């Protein structure tokens, strides 16, 4: 129990570090699914999917996609499992015309992606996570790349220089070298010649070559542990890297449940994994929460599978979805707020968040988070249910802001209207939220794995034990 | 030069790692200078001393001298030379009574040491560096320790909790987390006035009992080593640069003399020989530099007065002259060079600079002006440095770069060491440095050149300043 | 017992604030505590020829005062300066030198505010006065210490009746003017030469010291409240009265110093070792920049002439330096600064560092400052605590302590203490007592506290040397 835990953290720090933007974590999950069998299953083919198979993908390589159908996967009992995250973090984000000169410095112009607390991303070892665009020959090469070498910094003025407010315009503008450096190492205009230097060296091509890029800031210092009992985790983008991991984890337990199983009910639901982009800037794009694509990907599952039934039965691909979401849940992962010991103004004092006292169900009157009561009684029940087999507890704790105070959204509600699916919001507490560098406690990384994997083993099973009004 | 610049550069860093409080940069400092062939002097000893020696002494652990007495050094024609620094940077110290419990976490009471820029400590991995006072028998330990592990955290309040414009309360928000309650039970499952999981960590790592822990002066350090950054590995990046990056250069430029001279003698077996060079680093200048080992204390006056005492015990005694009358006369020919870290010209905020007096990095030396005397700088003794950077050249062939330094009029800045030194000792003086970005941070940004001119130019000042000063044509 | 002791102090403490008034007689009277325990009078102005094993007492311009024992071995080699710290002047409305003022038929006083003094306290007080009077007799320059214990002076607050009515706004200069007489008296009495004086002052001041009006030249005065201090509480475990800071921590500094002296004067231990210093400087309300403050050269110069009295010998004819003997001995000397602390206040919780609060009868502060307000480093006060172990071990009876800091948002004031390590170029520590109301006419403290600083200052001057030789380097 507490081997495992301090594992599973060991295993989220490495992919963490791994994961330094959008793209790089949309990677590592993909490749972490492969490595269990998943089939690469691609938008631009012809999707003929088999029960008792797995499936992977990587939407524009930056919206990851798990899939199992269910060996006896049917339209009648039957139940489609999604268990969400959010593979995209706050990060400053080299623009298109990134070539600034001031002070006889090199600089490099970035956009403020999502809400972040900037000003810690302010005197820290600065690498590079992103998608590149070169060309080679008469192609168009797409290339993901991570330097983990210090190459940016965004240096602070000092104190003495001042009688703090940081315009994110002016303020927020990262040295790359100085124009001495660059004069030395010489002997479109719109790229900075350092990062296009750099850039060229890493992808082993010319400067010319480098066409576009999307390429987020990423702090070096590799995520680890923390407290005199290394009983914390300490890291960048734990909002929702290590939520995903968990989303992932789980997922790829239960999938190995069935394959050990295979060499009762467990085998009648589609089970989903999906990590969307787009989060930390409200999700209207192709690859955020708010795209048609996993409607579409449901529908195009449905099709394959019961290809047979549609044509004999006489049913629409409407008929059986609306069948299936009447035995259908939306476990929703995002990273939970931790109750601050020196911040006690911002705690609600009947929802108090402690570190490793477990899962965080999140409860939002103006539905922030998609949870209601009854689909959380659901899920505590599963809960129970594991605790039964085996012998180990899902620690949970409800959460709540204070009435007179606002908070942040998730995708919960967007997905649950976009599908008409119920749901709840759930994560793991941490604090410093929207920092280059994050908190959490190791116990909780346990908890949220198993409380992932207890949701796709007993929700089918719980809603048998349902009486209604 | 090139070579030999990223050769300092790495030697700074490494100087830096090792030490991560005002007492690991004075242990750091004196066994680079053992390592050199430097006498061990105590002050509680009579000083029995001899020309064509070095001496270092540590004034309470905290304070940093290294001197050497030149092989004709005389009343006459002699010169003091001394070059300064701090060995003190801005610091989150832990408080005596430090045992805070909090929604079920147990942090540590902190307090805060000099002007620095707090908001920078928080989400970083901090250990520790200082003082360790424990009871081992019938004996008072003193032990230096310094915990490279990452075992204390300032964690930041969410963005969504908070209603762009940073306000720190220095006492309510500035208290770092150590561990859950739940995980101090599950370890005491397997004075009141310290935390218990700071106890068990300093037990561990002195090897007594935590009952034996009595008092102790620690500084919460950054885990994240100092560093080069840049696409061209141009800058160096890492904490304490203000002042560990110029003290490292005032001992570089001194040891580098004191070898020049031990190289001299060995080849001719001239003027190098005829004074008294001294490097100090002082602790305290965060704070107003008021204690037994800061730069307003007699403590300097004093061992200038003890070397003149046996140095010249012959003289006092034969010529009858006063250790008054030969300090007067020394002091006339004596200087102080000040080293301390200098602003380079932000470029994200061109406010702040004085338009014709602006610093670049690999630009040199700042030779920092100041009208209200917060810089000792006067024109005649920058210009005295300014000639023994020539005389360097001419020699060495090398050029030690340099660059006028001034805030804006209507702007304050703040005050260095110099003068206060320059009263004490009634001596001329100078305020250098070298420019870096982010001061008082806990990652501070300089360049790779200025390390390499700033120990040149400390070496060129011991070199040719007595030399410089007899070219001088008084009114 | 233990008790009976503690009340015994502070019952001496009570008595020796009474008739210290001000600086001037807070000197007078710790110099006739002195004189009395045996010390010598020193002047500066004389050539020191001092002996081992005896007492000195100095006082510079009679407004700072100096005791110092040399001990019989008192040596270079191994011997240790130890000096224990307090302040003789307060804060205090002070009477100007043009202070004639007549308004509104009333003979009133110009007065200086002495010190960051709460002045709305010194309002409707009884006010005597207490200070050093300069007049003519014949051909001389007399000069003359004088206390006047019965009510002469007023300041009288403004009627809330003629104000918008709560808070409390005080010009310095226009309120704090304090009333001596009307101007039909003053007439009536004279009717039974400088304009400069209030004349009812001058009459006031001759009928005390027996001279003419004609015949006062300068003085130097402090107003001071006639009431004098007590026992306060529903069991008199408080005491209360002016000039807690500093009268009460200096006369327990002196207390201290002269419970050392009598155990050397019998009236392991290595007693006879070192070179015993207790300082009252003056000034510490204003700065301490004087020549009678703790930024004076005095205390250095002081030292000097002990090291070139005492060692004459290894000076003059084994050829050592003052500078070298002064910086050996520098090494294992130390100063205990005393000046009062704040006691936690019961209605003002806010002001409070939740984790370095000070409770009445709780015992000595070892006062913590980061931008060294206070002397106190980590080390030298884990010395200092050592110091009150081994007392402990002999005597039975336990040193209590308690640790303060202010909180990291707000500013505390200063000490003299690290005036003094820079000076001197020696380590020390800021102690003090719990007290409540600083700078007020009226101060309160608590019994028990007195006792344990009296007994914290003899143990650090009795155990200092033997904890140092236990010490044990990097
Ligand atoms: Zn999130
Ligand atoms: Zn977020
Ligand atoms: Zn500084
Ligand atoms: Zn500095
Ligand atoms: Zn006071
Ligand atoms: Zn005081």
């Not at 998943?38 to 999707?47: A, M, Q, V, Y």
């Not at 080679?136 to 993901?144: H, I």
């Amino acid at each position: 129990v507490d081997k495992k835990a301090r594992e599973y953290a060991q295993d989220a720090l490495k992919f963490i570090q791994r994961s330094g933007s959008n793209f790089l974590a949309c990677k590592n999950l993909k490749e972490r699914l492969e490595n269990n069998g998943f089939i690469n299953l691609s938008e631009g083919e012809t999707w003929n999917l088999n029960k008792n198979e797995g499936y992977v993908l990587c939407k524009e390589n930056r919206n990851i996609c798990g899939f199992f159908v269910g060996k006896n996967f049917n339209i009648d009992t039957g139940s489609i499992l999604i268990s969400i995250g959010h593979i995209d973090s706050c990060a400053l984000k080299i623009s298109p015309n990134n070539n600034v000169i001031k002070k006889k410095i090199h600089q490099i112009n970035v956009e403020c992606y999502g809400s972040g607390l900037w000003h810690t991303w302010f005197d820290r070892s600065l690498g590079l996570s992103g998608q590149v665009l070169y060309k080679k020959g008469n192609k168009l090469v797409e290339k993901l790349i991570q330097i983990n070498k210090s190459v940016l910094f965004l240096p602070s003025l000092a104190i003495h220089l001042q009688n703090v407010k940081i315009n994110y315009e002016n303020h927020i503008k990262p040295i790359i070298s100085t124009t001495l450096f660059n004069q030395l190492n010489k002997c479109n205009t719109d790229n900075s010649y350092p990062l296009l230097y750099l850039l060229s060296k890493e992808l082993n091509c010319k400067e010319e070559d480098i066409l576009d890029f999307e390429l987020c800031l990423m702090d070096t210092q590799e995520p680890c542990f923390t407290g005199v009992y290394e009983e914390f985790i300490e890291g960048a983008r734990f909002d929702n890297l290590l939520g995903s991991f968990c989303v992932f984890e789980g997922f790829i337990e239960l999938v190995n449940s069935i394959k050990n199983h295979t060499s009762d009910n467990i085998h009648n639901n589609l089970y989903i994994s999906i990590g969307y982009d787009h989060e930390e800037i409200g999700s209207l794009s192709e690859v955020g929460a708010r795209s048609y694509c996993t409607k579409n990907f449901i529908d195009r599952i449905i099709s394959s599978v019961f290809k047979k039934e549609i044509h004999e039965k006489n049913l629409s691909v409407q008929e059986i979805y609306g069948n299936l979401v009447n035995r259908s849940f939306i476990l929703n992962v995002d990273m939970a707020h931790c109750s601050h010991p020196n911040y006690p103004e911002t705690v609600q004092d009947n929802h108090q968040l402690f570190f490793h006292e477990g899962i965080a169900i999140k409860y939002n009157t103006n539905k922030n988070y998609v949870t209601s009561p009854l689909h959380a009684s659901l899920i505590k029940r599963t809960f129970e249910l594991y605790y039964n087999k085996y012998k180990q507890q899902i620690k949970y704790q409800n959460f709540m802001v204070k009435n007179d105070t606002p908070c942040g959204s998730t995708v919960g509600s967007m997905v649950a209207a976009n599908l008409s699916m119920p749901g709840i919001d759930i994560g793991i507490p941490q604090l410093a939220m929207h920092s280059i560098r994050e908190i959490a406690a190791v116990h909780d990384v346990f908890f949220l794995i198993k409380g992932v994997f207890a949701f796709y083993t007993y929700y089918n099973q719980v809603l048998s034990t349902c009486v209604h009004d």
